[PDB]
């Protein structure tokens, strides 16, 4: 993580699937490497069901496109969803929407069903604290392929489940050829409507950040930002990650800054803009136009600047700390002569600098 | 706090402002007293505007009906929201079934930006650790104001001072000396602020302050035969960690009933937004203490450890339950099922097959 | 809480159930009052069984004599304990000198599984932060029941409801309507549960709830000439962190004495399990407030900052000290030895050699 | 820590001693390596005294066999044990027993005296947080050999202690030839009976986990488990480790699972059983019988299964987090059609799966 | 960080400056390396102004010599210093003195002005938690050289600031040839006298540790010590570092010890003394006289001993934990026979050992 030049990123292992495609971003990129994370962009056109797995790294998922339904399983917590002995029982379900962020902790089983094609981006802190495995991404697929039970032998596994050895193989999903997402032919109904678990079991898991009616900052000529973090999502006090949704208009520029306490992982959901970034050397490492569908990793302490083109700049900042922070009004706080002497400015230029 | 009876309780005291009504449940009410809370139903016509005022108590507020804005400002946090507009702190756009968290000495203005009227029932913890002073509701009116009518604060300051204090001309306006429109006045030609629609760091500041809980797609339980339960606590909204109030929204489909239970860490303040339904409550000495039907628009406080039982009607039953701790909890009797079988047989003298019939 | 005298205090009120006696120390007792606690001695014959009941207060319980089970259940935690047996939550096997932590609105049943009778003296914090409501002991009787005798809770619920609530036939048993055996009934042909002997995730659930403190091999101090002190606080049992009670078991060999000291962060509730010994206590205005001998089976509350002095007898002295905070502390006068020497000479007008004689 | 195959482990440096033997487990094993710990099995037949040292890594010790007496020294804490100026004074002592767990934090001086031969196993989180030294095991022996004072010169050290230079050498233990444990010829009496320190100084240090009267889970046909962690041992909120004691009967099988938030370090104290373990690849990495006296490292997220032979399976799980967790009732919480579609099962097989 | 021998350290990259000189300590020294920090000794003779930068690592600065004035900028916090629209406004300023410690967190902008030549030493935990960049020292100079804005292009930057492209270049400080510190010709007045920010914004930042009227320990024949840490400086609960000021007189020796929970970074401000240090091997790694102006790194768990020469030994211990600790009264707490048998001592030598 001593970088000469910044690149913009695009998935480097695309894998196709029955109800989607998996565009992996490869992490051996020194950028990703220095970042210490992975991201995975993945699409599930309708009826599609992504196979419940669990990942090495705790993960944030932002729903780039559309409504849907996601499912996460928290051990020791009782299935609070029932009908009618029983017709069905299962965990709580979460019906997500266009622009929610989803927080998945390690060794936890997520899955979601495409209730337009759902598009959503996902990052995994491979350098997180509770990834006591290696510094990589390990999905432990429960189903499909092998899935985790592959290495479990039928002989043992039947009595584990307490049933025939025939049925067990059908859980090995050996001949399965549909990957992480599947077509749900005959649809897929889950029980939707229309005690210690009141606390630890029922803690919120996604937040809709794209709601411009939720913005944190906002200029009408023009832009907006909102921050997702532990002050808004309790689970986030724990994931050591936080989210930013910056939407800028025509010729908007964000007050320059550097991230005090995190890297920043910039993915453009739309609009176009040049981004300029310089390192501690002062020399410029990055400088380029960013457009829809594109990834820039912008790290810690380094200095960043952006303005949208004539079409806009809609994006999503993921960072590596429970409340990541930028320092913009960085110079508006020094005494002016400090500015003067540090630059060789008269007063007026010092004051002009501080006051626009 | 040794009360003998529970009764459906209602705004004993009501006052229309100019753009809405305030429906005051009693303060020194035995229940409320031992409850250690104060509460209110407020209503706001469209265009109607609730006065700025900070309250002694942590306003947890529930927007039953209507939509709009509420503006809370966190002084010391930089206002975050040329042709024609000003600046000010971020403002908050509520909806039906929203929960709103307003602390103490925190300020909040409220405006009805369209549609129908807005009604929010409020709960104020008048005995919180933060409630210094005494156990009433103190509402420090920033603005405005037969019998004893309040005033805003600035009338308690001399003009020259005030004038000298603010550098505005010494020509009264601010004491709100003539006004009468109440804590809810109206903004006839609309009110515009800095809102998103167009079209064509902060840490302790960015915190969320509202969380929609009326939404069905959110409920945590579905179904205790047969409604749904949505539960707000610090595990969903991090401010509660400091307010030490919790919230339940609970819609019971017809015929239904919620399991017998008692609030471990909690007094419960429950009220009927709608539907029609029964509640049965008891105490230590064995006898019940509430055998009566709760209809919409009626308040009932269910206390700690008191075991309680409800049952919906055919028009359903839809209550809202606000509780007194950041993570308030109840014990689902059924959740009993943890005592050993002989422990069930010896206590009540039943044979085994009875024991399991309950477990 | 300006009390003038301390006296050895005893169960003013006693009641035999059917399988044991309850020995009630007063509630509104000045001491107890300003102490902000309630307490009890309970006794249980073999086979005897304490009723399920949750208490308003955090039951810290001390098993002086006997062994057995206590079953606490943490609702929401999955019961963790075919031919012939049921299921239920894990149960807890106590012994002499055990400390038992039972919260509020927490349920606990207690059974004497052999040997001699069992006697546990209980301390209930009736003014905890968790004690919502008022400052008495409220015991919510799950089961069973001249003057005002309590009942269990379910009698406060109508049958059909109840019946409809539970899906059991409408044929009374559960209100405990005829019963009389008291909160301690007996299980004549034994009681069997799911215990280990044979032979041939949970986080907030797995927490420990008891910790043996009577064991000598545990004491922390040996010896202040000449007994031993074992000390239970959140640094040994993590629940206390939430109960905010602490515990001292202190066996004084004959002739001995414990250093003069006062409870910093603590009221002390001390009681004589055995032995024979003296206690001297004082306050602010200088004069003593307890000059008297404490024999076995007698309670004395030693308050905060009050400085205290004890001395064993020849039959020894063996007390148990339960205190009111998760980490309650005392100041060993000797631990004085930190004031500078001249600071000792000027205060009491002594020459240096006196000063050091104390230090 | 990208493993192809799991092995079962056996100490790799056995060193003999006057009152015992030290069977070290060598940590350059990629398993141990990926684990990031060390373990040391060590025996002290009676009268034996193990030399007070301090270790790099904070350590958990489980007393496999027998009662005894252990001693730990907490700086700044006053010797609360006295007699009679004085005859003796010293720290509190802890008389341990068959099956206690002992928690030793870093840079802290433990020692114990064999009051049957005492057998006890010890693990050291070499990757812990406060091991700011290298990623290895460093015992800093106070006595014996050299011991820590070896490099201290007599000339300086005497006046340090404030005594003759003759006596100092006898603390160098130069000619000492008895290692970490010693025979206590003339026995060894320590004062046993038969204020800010009431808190920070007196926090409990061992727990008896083997007490089947302490089990957390229990089936009478048959098995039991108990968990030792910060909810039972306060010190454990700090050591970033927790303990599990699983005892299974005839043909008992533990509900499969993976450790969410830790590795698991399986040592068999008795009984025999096959253990089956598979990685994220699904492929099987482990599969083998485990018997008394044997070590298996089972990591994070990976999936494990075991049943005892006809003789039993008694063991002790040490894991690397203050409250390590497994996720078993992992599938009993998905909605059934999820299971169906993820495996291609009708309902009945889905429901049979969930309900046995 | 497996060391054979300890060296004493002296800056290895000295760089000269208009109002000072920068004597860098180079961290690729395995000592520094194993330490995982950097230190920088830097002088600012009067009128001098060191350029506001921000460093990779959070930093402690101890003012070896003289009074002065330091300035630190905390984003989101309003300039609480004003005059008179406005004549000047800026952050709070801190007028430091001979022997204060200064705590600078990452991605935060410090600077100070020489109000005798000011001398002060600075350490940077390069291995800290929120240095998510590499394991090195990155100063991000705001001004001077390039400074952070170098890589920012004039074209963009003017409208960023909202002003001419002429003035912007003068912020690039391209032709600047005065480095990190500058002469303040025409002096440098800053507004000195003679709400959520009452808490998070106003938390103390320096403490005067050299005040012998502040010592923690003290023998009049002779020595003194004081500890600076989170019990005295709240910010220090966060920096994961703490400070010790040991002053010893004629022939003073400090009670031997090892640091339980940190390394120790010894810099001599004066006086002279031999220091003796041994590793876990027992063998001696260090042994040498330390004099004014000299650095010794003394790590974790290792054992240390020092006495002053006839001139004294004044120094400053910086360590890597919010409340670093030493264990001295390490043997005064074992039972005596333990000592006896562990060394082969009679009673008297055991008791003599414990009682002097």
From Swiss-Prot, chains A, D, E:
Ranges where the Cupin type-1 domain occurs: 6-169, 207-351
Highest taxon in the source lineage: Eukaryota
Keyword Zinc: no
UniProt keyword annotation of Disulfide bond present: yes
Keywords of the record: Disulfide bond, Seed storage protein, Signal, Storage protein
Any one Gene Ontology cellular component term annotated for this protein: extraorganismal space
GO molecular function, one term: nutrient reservoir activity
InterPro entries found in the cross-reference section: 11S_seedstore_pln (IPR006044), Cupin_1 (IPR006045), RmlC-like_jellyroll (IPR014710), RmlC_Cupin_sf (IPR011051), Seed_Storage-Functional (IPR050253)
Expression by tissue: Endosperm of the seeds.
Coiled coil: none
GO biological process: seed development; seed maturation
Disulfide cross-links: 1-34, 77-201
Task performed by this protein: Seed storage protein.
Subunit: Hexamer; each subunit is composed of an acidic and a basic chain derived from a single precursor and linked by a disulfide bond.
UniProt similarity note: Belongs to the 11S seed storage protein (globulins) family.
Protein name per its UniProtKB record: Cocosin 1
Organism: Cocos nucifera (Coconut palm)
UniProt lineage: Eukaryota, Viridiplantae, Streptophyta, Embryophyta, Tracheophyta
Gene: COS-1
Swiss-Prot record, chains B, C:
Record-level GO cellular component terms: extraorganismal space
UniProt keyword terms in alphabetical order: Disulfide bond, Seed storage protein, Signal, Storage protein
SMART domains, sorted: Cupin_1 (SM00835)
Domain annotation Cupin type-1: ranges: 6-172, 211-356
Gene Ontology biological process terms in this record: seed development; seed maturation
Tissue: Endosperm of the seeds.
GO molecular function: nutrient reservoir activity
InterPro entries xrefs: 11S_seedstore_pln, Cupin_1, RmlC-like_jellyroll, RmlC_Cupin_sf, Seed_Storage-Functional
One family name in Pfam for this protein: Cupin_1
PANTHER family attached to this UniProt entry: 12S SEED STORAGE PROTEIN CRB, OS03G0336100 PROTEIN-RELATED
Protein purpose: Seed storage protein.
Subunit structure, interactors included: Hexamer; each subunit is composed of an acidic and a basic chain derived from a single precursor and linked by a disulfide bond.
Family: Belongs to the 11S seed storage protein (globulins) family.
Protein name as annotated: Cocosin 1
């Amino acid at each position: 993580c001593r970088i000469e030049r910044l690149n913009a990123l695009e998935p480097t292992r695309t894998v196709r699937s029955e109800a989607g495609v998996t565009d992996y971003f490869d992490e051996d990129n020194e950028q990703f490497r220095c970042a210490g994370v992975s991201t995975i962009r993945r699409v599930i056109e309708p009826r599609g069901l992504l196979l419940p797995s669990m990942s090495n790294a705790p993960r944030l998922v932002y729903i780039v496109q559309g409504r849907g339904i996601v499912g996460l399983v928290m051990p020791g917590c009782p299935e609070t969803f029932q009908s009618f002995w029983s017709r069905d029982e299962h965990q709580k379900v979460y019906q997500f929407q266009e622009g929610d962020v989803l927080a998945v902790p390690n060794g936890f089983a997520y899955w979601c069903y495409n209730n337009n094609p759902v598009v959503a981006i996902t990052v995994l802190d491979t350098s997180n604290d509770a990834n006591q495995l290696d510094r990589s991404h390990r999905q432990f697929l429960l189903a499909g392929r092998e899935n985790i039970l592959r290495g479990f032998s039928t002989e043992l596994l039947a009595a584990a489940f307490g049933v025939n050895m025939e049925l067990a193989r059908k859980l090995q999903c050996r001949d399965d050829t549909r990957g992480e997402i599947v077509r749900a032919e005959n649809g897929l109904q889950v029980l939707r409507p229309s005690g210690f678990e009141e606390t630890y079991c029922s803690m919120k898991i996604k937040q809709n950040i794209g709601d411009p009616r939720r913005a944190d900052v906002f200029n009408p000529r023009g832009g907006r930002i909102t921050t997702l973090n532990s002050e808004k999502l309790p689970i986030l006090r724990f994931i050591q990650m936080s989210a930013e949704r910056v939407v800028l208009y025509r010729n908007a520029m964000v007050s320059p800054h550097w991230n005090i306490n995190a890297h920043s992982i910039m993915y453009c959901t739309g609009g176009r803009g040049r981004v300029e970034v310089a390192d501690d050397r002062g020399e410029t490492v990055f400088d380029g136009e960013l457009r829809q569908g594109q990834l820039l990793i912008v790290p810690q302490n380094f200095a960043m600047l952006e303005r949208a083109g004539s079409a806009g700049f809609q994006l999503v900042s993921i960072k590596t700390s429970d409340r990541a922070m930028v320092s913009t009004s960085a110079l508006r706080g020094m005494p002016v002569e400090v500015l003067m002497n540090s630059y060789r400015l008269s007063r007026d230029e010092a004051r002009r600098v501080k006051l626009t």
